[PDB]
Amino acid sequence: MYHNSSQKRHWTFSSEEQLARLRADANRKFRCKAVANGDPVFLEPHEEMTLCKYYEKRLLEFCSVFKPAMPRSVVGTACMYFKRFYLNNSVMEYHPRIIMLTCAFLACKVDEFNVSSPQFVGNLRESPLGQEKALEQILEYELLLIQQLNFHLIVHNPYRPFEGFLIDLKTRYPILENPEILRKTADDFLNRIALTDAYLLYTPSQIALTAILSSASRAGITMESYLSESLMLKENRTCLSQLLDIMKSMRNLVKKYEPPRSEEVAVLKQKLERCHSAE
Template structure:
């Protein structure tokens, strides 16, 4: 259950400012690593780095690529797997910079791990077979995914179970059918509510609110767009008629969730291309030239041995239903 989960305890934050602070710190941490590497790098100055805004543009670009990859995946990828992959991606870059770990491979690793954790049984060859690459290119991609998989699990703090809003949405639709007879056909709300959840995936809603709060907002937003008022559902069926304080808090939270979706902007293609060039230069000039002291795919702090990390990983995944 969400209320006893690692998601609520470790990955649900108080406000957007907390998230912005973490991302800023990740940006600064990478800069400090480069400066403290002890190696003279050509053309190193502040303009060489991506600033937080530029990182965000690239993050949104690769997040959309991740979702497109999942949408076109064969066999059809369940919504829960897509939601889990997107949340892994968002959590990873709370504490890491795109300058240190390239999102092109991290996004695929997130999708690959989500398939495993949510028990969507596809083989590794099936997975990379969805990439528009040659056989050699697919083999190389799989090598990179497997190389980054343990790193991803570690950076997620072994909290691998993600509670998505799709199941609560089904619960609300069933509840509307059985207890809210005022609404003749609750199924008419499904498509717009599904679209709302898909859009919410590309925001920080899942890092700020519970899955049921997001799902309820999707239902009420869908009803509102259809010209249906459902205030009585909140008051009567959800037992908030005599709890004005909780009702007001819930309405305020739903307003915040809708604002997150309203604020979302598609990444500008010209900006994406410009920042991509900058990112490739960073990886070529900074990341790949700094001695690491380990064999990881990027320079990082000392990690546990592969054997101990693999043992921890197995233990975490074996008990993931408790998270």
């Protein structure tokens, strides 16, 4: 359960400043290791972030067209693994193209999505020789990925909390006529929330509730009474204010999100391939 999970205990951070600190520290430690081992070949932490965002979209695209149909829980677990890995590691040391596939592989194992390795790599749009090479790379990096996750494999995603909130609204909030009208748009917001650092900063339940309430606000529906009365936050107004602040912060994270630009990402990809070819 989330309330005593490893995700809450070790992988939900207090602020974006902490995440930036971890990423900059990873970039700097790779820089120091490379300098000791052996120039402007290094990528900056914001360039690492841009590449990580791009490769997270690529991981999402890989999981979407993956046959057999990969469940949404496996995809969420894989994306969480990717984010957590690149919190403490540099894309210059481990290529995100292979790490993302390794994340999908490990998530398929952890979430009991039974797929054989050959049928896992058959989803790649590459040649059979490239498929075998990719499989060997994935097998090489599986243990590394598990180590960098500190052997914390269960990932709590907002999808089941989202379903539970829909059930609770249908049962206890007649003011909302048909809560299912809120699904699609909330799902949309969910996707957007997933692109940010929110999954490292907020609980799955908070993410789900934020998505639902943003969907309601877009629909114009006010569900302040659901928080106040059904969730009984009128007894602790401080709890209600903290929850509202959390959702406002998440909405701000979504609104400020800067999708990676094609040309900037292409330049960064040339830079990263140069960094991997050298050393």
